[PDB]
Design a protein around this ligand. Structure first.
Ligand SMILES: *[C@H](O)[C@H](C[C@@H]1CCNC1=O)NC(=O)[C@@H]1CC2(CC2)CN1C(=O)[C@@H](NC(=O)NC(C)(C)C)C(C)(C)C
Ligand SMILES: *[C@H](O)[C@H](C[C@@H]1CCNC1=O)NC(=O)[C@@H]1CC2(CC2)CN1C(=O)[C@@H](NC(=O)NC(C)(C)C)C(C)(C)C
Lengths: 306, 306
């Protein structure tokens, strides 16, 4: 037992990270087969970042302008294209470490592992969620752009996020691996702001089931609630609405613990209305919302990957 | 910016994990050069676990009793020895993925990354601390024994922990890679119990510096305190004593933020005495103690590894 914020093993992704340098900008790229993917603002300069016209900017570039370091080795660029906000550098060598992989665009509420990188070298791995307002609460310094987020499913890496920028609240915005931003954000330095976040209700319920699986029961009650009456309380506390579909997803966990979904909703309702009274759940004094129902079942049953 | 519980990239360790099966027991082993390291209770049976005599148990074994899976391959055992509570299986193939590495026995308060494994296959990676009572608050199910904890320093993996058992409070006990248990624990099923844990004071102060680096300042004050008067408050709240040596270690962080160590102690004192008044620090409603001063400097400055 025990319950931790757990990231996927990062080895399959580490073998893909490279350094991309162009002009005065250095950031990370993702090397899969003979293509290196990276944020298109690598073509920008310190004065370009204001309101750049990237199509104009890119036509002025030559392959040799792009310096691509894979550890201790030049990769030669032989072609380049732009897809949405990502740049695709064709290189003359296929990455022999290329895992089985997929690109996926995730829904808000879904979680992933981030391999933070600088200069093409991995620094650390941690677990994030796509917030309802399409930011992520990351840990990113200058040079971290092109670090990716991902999930692993048996032997297949599903890449879902590439880091582009930091918002003035200290949170982070980026794209899928096809270069489409999550949320309303754009890669230019104009006024943008997150807009109001909310708590991921179905994940909070999943984490309460994790707590029960692990022996914290102090918050259970004999009450129950209807879905409608629960959502009336949810909206007051800035929680996302719980749909019948969420209820269905929580079925396995409800079946393992013996606690009907709407009974767990009654418990969340009283925790919202009363607070925790000096008590903790799974070592937290806040209601945790960055574990999905799948995350809870993975970690409480022990699923692996090769 | 941002601040997360960050583990080391796990790739160098993933390449070392193997499956060790003997009789009815299956657990994980660590394959470095031509030796596989694993917990010695793999030689035990369901009735052996009570009060076993492992030296008697081991003399009854033959090399061929030990089944060692490295993915899709038999490794043949050609010799075996016992060192403290770990078993060392000599195999006829050196691991070509063996990283540069070291075995280190860590002090309480120090943190490390755990690569949780089942059947020789990595499941997830998370960050832990060695508690003052020499347990770790892990996430471990049946089959996880032989999963290791580690730190990485440039290109060198320092292995510091191997998982052996779970205590009735849901926390975990294990050894260094030379097989010596951390704390008073033994690998037999007799009454054992953790004994009273305490909060890692120097780490809490490091995390408060992280908060300042990241823009949370609401908890600062103009007070200060002496070391003696701080430790008088520490002991009341079950915090470990802060030594002058801890104060010295916190020097770099104090210099970066402009906040003298003993001034940060004055702030911790008021947080201990007043609580947080509905406020959070770095997204936590509790005072966090599983980041060392080194962890904070690593993540706030961006150090990498190859
Ligand atoms: C790439 O490595 C870098 C990562 C940042 C640096 C600090 N933390 C991070 O995550 N990304 C950038 O530097 C990007 C590149 C652009 C688009 C041109 C600017 N940028 C930023 O992150 C900006 N942020 C903004 O300007 N944000 C808006 C426009 C106000 C929303 C800063 C952080 C450099 C100011
Ligand atoms: C190895 O994979 C396994 C990991 C455990 C299983 C549940 N969570 C874990 O971390 N370790 C064990 O099964 C070890 C092997 C022994 C020494 C023989 C027993 N054991 C345990 O963890 C015991 N725990 C205890 O018996 N603890 C004491 C003696 C009461 C302190 C249990 C969990 C199997 C009961």
């Amino acid at each position: 037992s025990g319950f931790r914020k757990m990231a996927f093993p990062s080895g399959k992704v580490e073998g893909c990270m490279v350094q991309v340098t162009c002009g005065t900008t250095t950031l990370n790229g993702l090397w899969l087969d003979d293509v290196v993917y990276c944020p298109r603002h690598v073509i920008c300069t310190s004065e370009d970042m204001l309101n750049p016209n990237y199509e104009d900017l890119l036509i002025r570039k030559s392959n040799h302008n792009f310096l691509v370091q894979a550890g201790n080795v030049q990769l030669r660029v032989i072609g380049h294209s732009m897809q949405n906000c990502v740049l695709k550098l064709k290189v003359d060598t296929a990455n022999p470490k290329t895992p089985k992989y997929k690109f996926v665009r995730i829904q808000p509420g879904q979680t992933f592992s981030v391999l933070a990188c600088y200069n093409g070298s991995p620094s650390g791995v941690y677990q994030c969620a796509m917030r309802p307002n399409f930011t992520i609460k990351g840990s990113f310094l200058n040079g971290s752009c092109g670090s990716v987020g991902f999930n692993i499913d048996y032997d297949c890496v599903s890449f879902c996020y590439m880091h582009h920028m930091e918002l003035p609240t200290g949170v982070h915005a980026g794209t899928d691996l096809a270069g489409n931003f999550y949320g309303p954000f754009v890669d230019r330095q104009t006024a943008q702001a997150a807009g109001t976040d909310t708590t991921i209700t179905v994940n909070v319920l999943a984490w309460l089931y994790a707590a029960v699986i692990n022996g914290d029961r102090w918050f259970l009650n004999r009450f129950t609630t209807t879905l409608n009456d629960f959502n009336l309380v949810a909206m007051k506390y800035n929680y996302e609405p719980l749909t019948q579909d969420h209820v269905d997803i929580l079925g396995p966990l409800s079946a393992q613990t013996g606690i009907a979904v709407l009974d767990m909703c009654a418990s969340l309702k009283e925790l919202l209305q009363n607070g925790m009274n000096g008590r903790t759940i799974l070592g937290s004094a806040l209601l945790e919302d960055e574990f999905t129902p799948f995350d809870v079942v993975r970690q409480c049953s022990g699923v692996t990957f090769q």
